[PDB]
Amino acid sequence: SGIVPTLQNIVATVTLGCRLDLKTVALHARNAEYNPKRFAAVIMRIREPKTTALIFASGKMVVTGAKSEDDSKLASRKYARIIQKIGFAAKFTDFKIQNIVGSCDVKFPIRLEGLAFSHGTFSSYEPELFPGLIYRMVKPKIVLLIFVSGKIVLTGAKQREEIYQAFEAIYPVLSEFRKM
DNA sequence: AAAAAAAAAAGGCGCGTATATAAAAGTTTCAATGTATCTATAAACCTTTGATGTGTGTTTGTACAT
């Protein structure tokens, strides 16, 4: 392989443990996008770490755009601190990353036609809307989006580690299906 | 001939085309349930019309003044 699956989004859940006044949360924040007509969750974008989070009336926050487990975790801790400054005793309790989506590259042109045709059972293709293949692995259970540019979009894991394992499993397939 | 307002016109903002990831909230759609509202329909009445025993009626025989 020799290629790290480069994460582009990490979505995580944080139980602040309080019924947050989403109106006051929006009011006391600096740049927060909350109005009920789209969702029941204040969405805040913090530039450091730059993450976008929706926090619900349950006080549960789901965070996206992180580049690491620690980007999301530190961002969520900052989010809880911001909520506490707002006035609600937010606390980092029973945190869990619900999604780790990444894009990386293997850089060798691929016979995507070969894979999809011979892995019709596993991968399906209708190249007249979107030129990417969809592949599944159960161990680890990662779904992977493949495009001729070599871009690999690995999704379906709470951790980047399942991303890494399925990438170490799928890059050999890619090189096998490398078009030249 | 000169001043002012709208259109002619394009390129790009920015997310629909996929697009899967997952939690978080909510909607709408589907089907069983409930109900007043059609209807026929045969079972209620009212009137009709053909068949009907018989009250009244033609012969028999009568006490009864005449």
UniProtKB/Swiss-Prot annotation:
It is found in: Nucleus. Keywords: DNA-binding, Nucleus, Repeat, Transcription. GO terms for cellular component: nucleoplasm; nucleus; protein-containing complex; transcription factor TFIIA complex; transcription factor TFIID complex; transcription factor TFIIIB complex; transcription regulator complex. Sequence repeats lie at residues 7-83, 97-174. The keyword Transcription applies. One of its GO terms (molecular function) is RNA polymerase I general transcription initiation factor binding. Its main location: nucleus. One of its GO terms (biological process) is positive regulation of transcription by RNA polymerase II. General transcription factor that functions at the core of the DNA-binding general transcription factor complex TFIID. Binding of TFIID to a promoter (with or without TATA element) is the initial step in preinitiation complex (PIC) formation. TFIID plays a key role in the regulation of gene expression by RNA polymerase II through different activities such as transcription activator interaction, core promoter recognition and selectivity, TFIIA and TFIIB interaction, chromatin modification (histone acetylation by TAF1), facilitation of DNA opening and initiation of transcription. Belongs to the TBP family. Binds DNA as monomer. The 1.2 MDa TFIID complex is composed of TATA binding protein (TBP) and the 14 TBP-associated factors. One copy of each TAF1, TAF2, TAF3, TAF7, TAF8, TAF11, TAF13, two copies of each TAF4, TAF5, TAF6, TAF9, TAF10, TAF12, and three copies of TAF14. Interacts with TFC8. This is TATA-box-binding protein. It comes from Saccharomyces cerevisiae (strain ATCC 204508 / S288c).
